[PDB]
Amino acid sequence: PLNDVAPFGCSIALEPLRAENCAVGSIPISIDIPDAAFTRISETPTVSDLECKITECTYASDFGGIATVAYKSSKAGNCPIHSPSGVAVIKENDVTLAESGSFTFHFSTANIHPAFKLQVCTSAVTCKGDCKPPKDHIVDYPAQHTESFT
Amino acid sequence: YKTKVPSPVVKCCGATQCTSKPHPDYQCQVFTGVYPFMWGGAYCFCDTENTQMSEAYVERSEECSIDHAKAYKVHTGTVQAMVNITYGSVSWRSADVYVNGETPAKIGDAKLIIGPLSSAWSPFDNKVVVYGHEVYNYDFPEYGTGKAGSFGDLQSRTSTSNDLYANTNLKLQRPQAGIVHTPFTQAPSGFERWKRDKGA
Amino acid sequence: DLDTHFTQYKLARPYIADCPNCGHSRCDSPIAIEEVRGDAHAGVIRIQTSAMFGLKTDGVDLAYMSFMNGKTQKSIKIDNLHVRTSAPCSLVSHHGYYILAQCPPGDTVTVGFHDGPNRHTCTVAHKVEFRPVGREKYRHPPEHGVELPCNRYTHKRADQGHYVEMHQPGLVADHSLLSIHSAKVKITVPSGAQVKYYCKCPDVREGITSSDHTTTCTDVKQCRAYLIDNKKWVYNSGRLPRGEGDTFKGKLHVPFVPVKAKCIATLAPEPLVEHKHRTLILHLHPDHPTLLTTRSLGSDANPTRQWIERPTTVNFTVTGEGLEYTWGNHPPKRVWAQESGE
Amino acid sequence: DLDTHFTQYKLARPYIADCPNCGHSRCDSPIAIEEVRGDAHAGVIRIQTSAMFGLKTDGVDLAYMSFMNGKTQKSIKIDNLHVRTSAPCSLVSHHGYYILAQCPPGDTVTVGFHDGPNRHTCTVAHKVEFRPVGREKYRHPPEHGVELPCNRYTHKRADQGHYVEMHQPGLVADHSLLSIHSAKVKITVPSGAQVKYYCKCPDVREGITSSDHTTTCTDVKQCRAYLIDNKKWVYNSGRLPRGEGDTFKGKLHVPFVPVKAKCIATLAPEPLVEHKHRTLILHLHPDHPTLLTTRSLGSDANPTRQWIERPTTVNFTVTGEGLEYTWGNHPPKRVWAQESGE
């Protein structure tokens, strides 16, 4: 059966004749957010004059990569985060901040020297470093999905 | 092995936490969501709080005493012989001797020193398995390690030894559709095979 | 409610046909086996005897037993039914002409009750198997394992999902009728039934009568001993002679519809997962022949299939993105094999 | 001396458990089959029914038959036992919960007696085979051939070589108890046994009583019909509910120990020895698949193995010093092949 011989990762049902979960290629997705959901810029803390560094980067799929960040805030509150580079995939969307504290997040990468920017609510930073291979690879599918030239 | 299942617990309304008893390969897993048909339809009046705790450990078969493979670490030892000499005019001595080149055996009238032989090929390998009469110069994995299904899934020091190593991959599953029984999902033994997919 | 299918019961009779190897050879058994169906999965076969067991002639107790002895029924107890194959089967239920029974595989099918004075069985050829649904090729259903959608027949009778045509019987022979009137061959009648009669010589040419004589012929062996007795319809067996007059009514249901039961079903022992560099060694050890298969999830599928009954250490070149793994009807596994070569 | 194992007899009862394919489907048969052991060689299987046949309830005659009907035993005659598999087996002996029977190979095991009103059988899956010990792979023991050390179970009972734990039963359901007191649900007791009782509503919460009523609830289907009746222990079946109180005593032997009987055993027809120059042509013609093998006695072993069932002319490059030859469990031969090339 095609749910046992298909390519590019599909599952099947005698139901509307779907082929579920076919992981292949990309999708050009575009959203119109409600502007009410936005927070104006003058209310989130400005975080610059910070510092970022890995502490135990795991060169892996599960979110084993970690990095403290010397947060240098202005106000105190939440701060959404993301790596605009696809090198690093982060488990935390948002980090809470006191007045210029420090909070580690989790992530995963594919390049031995992860030189990925991190955009902590309008403040970029390179979390450069080096990572370690794991040992224990027999469980379902990854969060990394960013393999490239390394 | 013999999956000599101890009879599962069935608490009727609420959980029964299991503990890891020290039986060899004591597999035990609590289960809920039953409605156990036992001779009167079900008997526990709840419907999800009906709890069933299955437990199963591995134990030596009764055949383990008698029909059993047997590993060995084999060194060289010392070879023997019932050497007859119908000597000279003596005409007889049938004596058991050794090979080590200073042992006499004054059985009869003659004193005789044998060996040591130069041909030290012990046809036994270092590691050997033994079965009844068929001897297998097999690299048995070890006590304490044998992968389930593979040879030595059960590994008892001797027959008396209550302790053992039972990697059988014994995995209990929940009984079906509110009925009393014990799904034990297990590899038939690496002693079952090793009797019909063995070596010569 | 055993009283909801008088469609068949009142109106159908226990038919008698020609069993093929009826103990000795081709007899005419009332339990003549047609339409063997070893097409389900659950160890079950639905069978049709030409005999209509169930209620009696009149109104009571499914668990009684009406076959044809003579021109006549014999609506009595079911005491010692035996369906069997390579081994003795297990009855499941009877309704009408039809019985459901849990059988093992068998080259043939072999049926029979015991009236009490005689064995009186009937036997037939039919290729039977029981694959359970699943990638495990057992020979028999276990006590445990996963449930999954098998095909199987019901226990019950309150059933209309299909109906087979059951119109009249044709005539039948009965030379017990053709006695002798001390010089002439003498026909009689069951109960005023319609006896269709003439002999090779010229005498009465139709026969729709009470007990007639025969003026012309003398020998019993040259006359038409017939029974147009169409007060009760029959199953339209291939081993029936047509009732030449008409397609009478008698559309009649089937009890044992094939239904989407979830059989208590198969399960193969768990695998021994072993790591290597982008490679699954799997020492494996099943109970029965298990169809293993995989799907390397690249757009290069590169699948594999092999029934495994002999324990086997196998290998799978897993790629970077993943592979999946299907130990029988045990659920499909999945695996991240990124690097391990440091 | 059938009176030496009142360890089991007096103190154990015929247990009842859930047979998996009990004719129709999963019933609760007293002869519920656990621990099938097709592990010996002699065509024999040792089985445990949950039923304890043997002596009666009290004291007499191994060849009687006590299963559970109701909460109660029924210690009566064994008249029509049937163990069977692919074919009908042959009983060997019963003792306690346990029966030994000579069976052929079979994908399953299928057991059953006949009480007299009903067939009342029980059936189970178990992979069975019977290899005889020997390099011949028969399907069945012959009348003749060599004797050699097989594994096999005894006929007898005077047996202590092992013992299995047999502590109490847990409770059991019996909704025949929960009658109605004309508006309230009414429990009773067997003989003063310990009935463990309450309903979903709030009423009597333990139940250690004679026949109680139920003030609060009314429906039979929401109450605890239980029988703590631990006057006789049981086998510790997986299909038993635990007696939650304690690990009571009741260590109890096994009769049918596996013993080192020398089965009457196999033998393959003699070979046809044919000479050639340092070479044994052997036209060969077995009865059954025979594992032949040899040992070229040089320090170069160069052995060979092949099961032979199809008659085959084979060859063996014999050396100067010798070879040996093993036509099945027929004894090993030996051969001088010096020159023959002159």
Description:
This is part of a larger assembly, with 2 copies of chain A and 2 copies of chain C (342 residues). By secondary structure, chain A is mainly β. Chain A contains 1 helix and 9 strands, in the order αβββββββββ. The two termini of chain A are 37 Å apart. By secondary structure, chain C is mainly beta. The B-D interface holds B 2, 4-12, 36-43, 45, 53-54, 56, 61-63, 65-67, 121, 132-133, 179-182, 184, 188, 192, 195-196, 200 and D 16-18, 20, 26, 28, 35, 39-40, 127, 131, 149, 151, 161-162, 164-165, 170-176, 199-200, 222-226, 236-242, 244, 254, 257-260, 293, 299, 303, 305. The PDB classes it as virus/immune system. The entry lists the keywords cryo-EM, single particle, virus neutralization, inter-virion crosslink, aggregation, VIRUS-IMMUNE SYSTEM complex. Cryo-EM structure of SINV/EEEV in complex with Fab fragment of a moderately/weakly neutralizing human antibody IgG-94. Chains A, B: Spike glycoprotein E1.
Largest sheet geometry of chain C = 4 strands, antiparallel
The side-by-side strand order for the widest beta sheet of chain C comes to 1-2-7-6
The helix/strand series of chain A, from N terminus to C terminus, equals HEEEEEEEEE
What's the number of extended β-strand segments of chain A?
A: 9
One letter per element, helices H and strands E, the order of chain C comes to HEEEEEEEEEEEEEEEEEEEEEEEE
Radius of gyration of chain C: 29 Å
The coarse overall form of chain A would be globular
Number of strands of chain C: 24
Number of helices of chain A: 1
Task: Going across the biggest sheet of chain A, name each strand in turn.
Answer: 6-8-4-3-9
Tell me the fraction of residues in β-strands of chain C, as a range.
25-35%
Class by SSE composition of chain C: mainly beta
What kind of assembly state do the chains in view correspond to?
Answer: part of a larger assembly
The helix-and-strand class of chain A reads: mainly beta
Distance between the termini of chain C: 73 Å
Largest sheet of chain A, in brief, is: 5 strands, mixed
Can you count the helices of chain C?
1
Fraction of residues in helix of chain C: under 10%
Organism (chains C, D): Eastern equine encephalitis virus (strain Florida 91-469)
Protein name (chains C, D): Spike glycoprotein E2
Membrane topology (chains C, D): Single-pass type I membrane protein
Subcellular location (chains C, D): Virion membrane; Host cell membrane
